[PDB]
Design an enzyme around this catalytic site. Structure first.
Site, PDB file in Angstrom:
ATOM      1  N   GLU A   1      61.241  29.396  -6.831  1.00  0.00           N
ATOM      2  CA  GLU A   1      61.490  30.253  -5.685  1.00  0.00           C
ATOM      3  C   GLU A   1      62.405  31.440  -5.961  1.00  0.00           C
ATOM      4  O   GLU A   1      62.334  32.449  -5.264  1.00  0.00           O
ATOM      5  CB  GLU A   1      62.085  29.424  -4.538  1.00  0.00           C
ATOM      6  CG  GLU A   1      61.191  28.308  -4.043  1.00  0.00           C
ATOM      7  CD  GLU A   1      59.929  28.822  -3.358  1.00  0.00           C
ATOM      8  OE1 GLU A   1      59.080  27.999  -2.979  1.00  0.00           O
ATOM      9  OE2 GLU A   1      59.785  30.046  -3.187  1.00  0.00           O
ATOM     10  N   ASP A  41      57.755  37.471   0.979  1.00  0.00           N
ATOM     11  CA  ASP A  41      57.373  36.522  -0.045  1.00  0.00           C
ATOM     12  C   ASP A  41      56.008  36.933  -0.596  1.00  0.00           C
ATOM     13  O   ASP A  41      55.498  38.001  -0.252  1.00  0.00           O
ATOM     14  CB  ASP A  41      57.380  35.092   0.514  1.00  0.00           C
ATOM     15  CG  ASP A  41      56.270  34.836   1.496  1.00  0.00           C
ATOM     16  OD1 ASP A  41      55.666  35.811   1.990  1.00  0.00           O
ATOM     17  OD2 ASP A  41      56.009  33.648   1.782  1.00  0.00           O
ATOM     18  N   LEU A  45      61.627  30.482   4.362  1.00  0.00           N
ATOM     19  CA  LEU A  45      60.735  31.251   5.223  1.00  0.00           C
ATOM     20  C   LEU A  45      61.368  31.536   6.587  1.00  0.00           C
ATOM     21  O   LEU A  45      61.775  30.624   7.299  1.00  0.00           O
ATOM     22  CB  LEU A  45      59.424  30.494   5.425  1.00  0.00           C
ATOM     23  CG  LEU A  45      58.399  31.155   6.347  1.00  0.00           C
ATOM     24  CD1 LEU A  45      58.033  32.537   5.816  1.00  0.00           C
ATOM     25  CD2 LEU A  45      57.167  30.273   6.439  1.00  0.00           C
ATOM     26  N   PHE A  96      57.305  22.014   0.097  1.00  0.00           N
ATOM     27  CA  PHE A  96      58.293  23.039   0.326  1.00  0.00           C
ATOM     28  C   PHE A  96      57.589  24.388   0.398  1.00  0.00           C
ATOM     29  O   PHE A  96      57.905  25.206   1.245  1.00  0.00           O
ATOM     30  CB  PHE A  96      59.305  23.020  -0.816  1.00  0.00           C
ATOM     31  CG  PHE A  96      60.438  23.999  -0.663  1.00  0.00           C
ATOM     32  CD1 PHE A  96      60.263  25.348  -0.961  1.00  0.00           C
ATOM     33  CD2 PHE A  96      61.705  23.559  -0.277  1.00  0.00           C
ATOM     34  CE1 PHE A  96      61.349  26.247  -0.884  1.00  0.00           C
ATOM     35  CE2 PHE A  96      62.792  24.447  -0.200  1.00  0.00           C
ATOM     36  CZ  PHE A  96      62.614  25.788  -0.504  1.00  0.00           C
ATOM     37  N   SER A 149      42.596  15.546  -3.750  1.00  0.00           N
ATOM     38  CA  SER A 149      43.610  15.540  -4.796  1.00  0.00           C
ATOM     39  C   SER A 149      44.606  14.411  -4.552  1.00  0.00           C
ATOM     40  O   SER A 149      45.055  13.789  -5.500  1.00  0.00           O
ATOM     41  CB  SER A 149      44.398  16.854  -4.833  1.00  0.00           C
ATOM     42  OG  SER A 149      43.555  17.983  -4.758  1.00  0.00           O
ATOM     43  N   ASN A 154      41.111  19.248  -9.756  1.00  0.00           N
ATOM     44  CA  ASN A 154      40.868  19.453  -8.340  1.00  0.00           C
ATOM     45  C   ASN A 154      41.951  20.308  -7.658  1.00  0.00           C
ATOM     46  O   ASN A 154      41.650  21.126  -6.789  1.00  0.00           O
ATOM     47  CB  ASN A 154      40.741  18.100  -7.639  1.00  0.00           C
ATOM     48  CG  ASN A 154      40.268  18.236  -6.216  1.00  0.00           C
ATOM     49  OD1 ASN A 154      41.066  18.342  -5.289  1.00  0.00           O
ATOM     50  ND2 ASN A 154      38.956  18.260  -6.035  1.00  0.00           N
TER      51      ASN A 154
END
Length: 164
Positions: free
Chosen positions: A11, A20, A32, A104, A117, A132
């Site tokens: 990040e 972002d 965010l 996250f 998945s 996948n």
């Protein structure tokens, strides 16, 4: 290496509001703020989150405080989710961090959507899950980060973050 160091690498750290990868307004370590294009709306959310008039700028201590709250919220989000909890419980410690990373980044709703998945992760079919997971908007939009996470799910090690 641990989840905080891992996400800190993926990040980055910005002490000012910024857009972002997908246009949303964010600040600190991937926190965010709003999808809204209003810089005023983002500033309002930042002040609310920090509890003071930031004017768009926050200190490192504040970024980290938001970061601790967000990681904590990601974990609890996983544990309260019917589709995610079973997967999380079946995983080893390193792969759990990879799942937290995804949550996250895209929220429990988004990750809970990776139905096939998740099933593959549960059965411990590492290489099939990796293939996948790569067939996703996620991988195509943020390839470098997605492959570090996918590599972590595939190997069960921190190797993808070691060289970083």
């Amino acid at each position: 290496m641990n989840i905080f160091e891992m996400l800190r690498i993926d990040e980055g750290l910005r002490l000012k509001i910024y857009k972002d990868t997908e246009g949303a307004a964010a600040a600190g370590i991937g926190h965010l703020l709003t999808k809204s294009p209003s810089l005023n709306a983002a500033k309002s959310e930042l002040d609310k989150a920090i509890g003071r008039n930031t004017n768009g700028v926050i200190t490192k201590d504040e970024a980290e405080k938001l970061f601790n709250q967000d990681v904590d919220a990601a974990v609890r989000g996983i544990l309260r989710n019917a589709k995610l909890k079973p997967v999380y419980d079946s995983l080893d410690a390193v792969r759990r961090a990879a799942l937290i990373n995804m949550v996250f980044q895209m929220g429990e709703t988004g990750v809970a959507g990776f139905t096939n998945s998740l099933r593959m992760l549960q059965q411990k079919r590492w290489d099939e899950a990796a293939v996948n997971l790569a067939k996703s908007r996620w991988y195509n939009q943020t390839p470098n980060r997605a492959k570090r996470v996918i590599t972590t799910f595939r190997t069960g090690t921190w190797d993808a973050y070691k060289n970083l």
